[PDB]
Design a protein around this ligand. Sequence first.
Ligand SMILES: [Zn+2]
Ligand SMILES: [Zn+2]
Ligand SMILES: [Zn+2]
Length: 178
Amino acid sequence: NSNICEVCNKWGRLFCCDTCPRSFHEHCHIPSVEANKNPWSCIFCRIKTIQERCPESQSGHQESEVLMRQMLPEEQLKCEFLLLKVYCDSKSCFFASEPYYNREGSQGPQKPMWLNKVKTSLNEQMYTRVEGFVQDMRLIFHNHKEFYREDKFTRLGIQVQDIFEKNFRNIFAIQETS
Ligand SMILES: [Zn+2]
Ligand SMILES: [Zn+2]
Ligand SMILES: [Zn+2]
């Protein structure tokens, strides 16, 4: 197995996947690395299994149909994985914890949102459809773009949204278009 966390790229107290060489800090993995379970298979492995059991799941889908899906176990897992792929980018640090807003010429968003809040919401089974998770994720970046206006820091929102959207299209097998 790797000697660094797959998500934050640091060493430390690492839990190793039994079916692939990745490793994780306990609370870097999503869901948090399970107490017992021998063998243990990481979320990467669990997602690859879904695909392998239903190869047709990789055919193109319309975003509108994906969003309306209820959060059954496989969709819960897919949203957990997509959230983890965003934490995998170091620029996620800016969006992880609860933000505050005091900038001359701007007013804070009406509905603040952040990664750790989305993480808690998934853990608590608060989303009933894929749409709820996706709307909170996109709200993170939209709030950022609106608040930072012409400051060049707006770009961090565009960058991390791009990581979210590429991973959304991959994980939920969105039909490719120009
Ligand atoms: Zn880590
Ligand atoms: Zn694995
Ligand atoms: Zn099948």
